[PDB]
Symmetry: C2
Subunit: 209 residues, 2 copies
């Protein structure tokens, strides 16, 4: 009985990391075997290059950094398929959708070109998109020193996320991330319990193919 692959995507400060942590804690307390993953995975050789880039400690050519983000997913694919086949549900904080949206927000990058490197990745059984109005995101923090920490760029990435959501091949669910941390958690956890039960019924899919 395979585990489900559940991805959290969403606007800045909507709570992807907070909710992915709480979801894994809650699923394990309810008897599930569940583990947390995130992308970028900064612990690998490629992950260190990406971390330096995002921190602005280094500059990387836009196409090159897009492919490194994708490669950083591919290198975890053997582990992801092993865990899922062992019945472990994986809760992932960002995935290929962030990959496509963030490069897709840059000038002269088509969504098609941006998608290709990730075609074939393990297909999420559930993609949660945490929505939050900017007035509410503004009370949760201030723009940082990191790469992409600006409103004009996050808006362009948001348009790309909406283009991706038109893809009916994927089990997208919108989450109203403006509620309390607990209320949002409950919405996500109930959606996750449903997906976990149905994932044991269909083989793990392939993304965008």
């Amino acid at each position: 009985r395979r585990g489900a692959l559940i991805v959290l995507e969403g606007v800045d400060r909507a709570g992807k990391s907070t909710q992915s942590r709480k979801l894994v804690e809650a699923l394990c307390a309810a008897g599930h075997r569940a583990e947390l993953l995130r992308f970028p995975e900064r612990s690998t050789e490629i992950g260190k290059l990406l971390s330096s880039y995002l921190q602005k400690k280094s500059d990387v050519e836009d196409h090159s950094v897009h492919l490194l983000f994708s490669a950083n997913r591919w290198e975890q694919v053997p582990l992801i398929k092993e865990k899922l086949s062992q019945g472990v549900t994986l809760v992932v904080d960002r995935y290929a959708f962030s990959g496509v949206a963030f490069t897709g927000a840059k000038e002269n990058f088509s969504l098609d070109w941006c998608k290709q490197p990730d075609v074939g990745l393990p297909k999420p059984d559930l993609v949660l998109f945490l929505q939050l109005q900017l007035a509410d995101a503004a009370k949760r923090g201030a723009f940082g020193h990191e790469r992409y920490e600006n409103g004009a760029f996050q808006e362009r990435a948001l348009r790309c996320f909406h283009q991706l959501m038109k893809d009916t091949t994927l089990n997208w669910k919108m989450v109203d991330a403006s509620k309390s941390i607990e209320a949002v958690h409950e919405d996500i956890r109930v959606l996750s319990e449903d997906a976990i039960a149905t994932a044991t019924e269909k083989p793990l899919g392939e993304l965008w193919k």
Copy 2:
């Protein structure tokens, strides 16, 4: 008057490196501004990962290593376009075609998926493919300790190279690399002088788009 982008591809031991070196030497002695490039470019952070992989000092997941090879090309794109626009002809020892053929030779990799990451790269004005029968390649050396150093795998990559050569968008020229080093050089140098003259007439193209 832009420089030309000339790529050398070919079967193992056909003489890509020998001929790319001699071509750059000959073009500069004939008054051209010409420089040598090669892929993988092992000097960068990504290039070091690729070098370790090819030397079998490390293992890399097949998709991940394919994207790193492509990224290693992208990171040199700003330099390539700068040199070409300055009138410098660039002679390159392997390019995206090797990228697609070598991953394409592995099981479960379509030529389509393999091509995507390199779509958009600076398009070669001339792609030379050095052909050599295996009996003749056999007298030029013995299989090494490196990755891909085996006949069954080189044969699969060779089929992929022939699929790529069906692409009429590209100025492919076959070279009979079985002749002497000097005779092959002369064949390549005359083809290169012709391409250099015509490249000053059309803008640098984009590969596979």
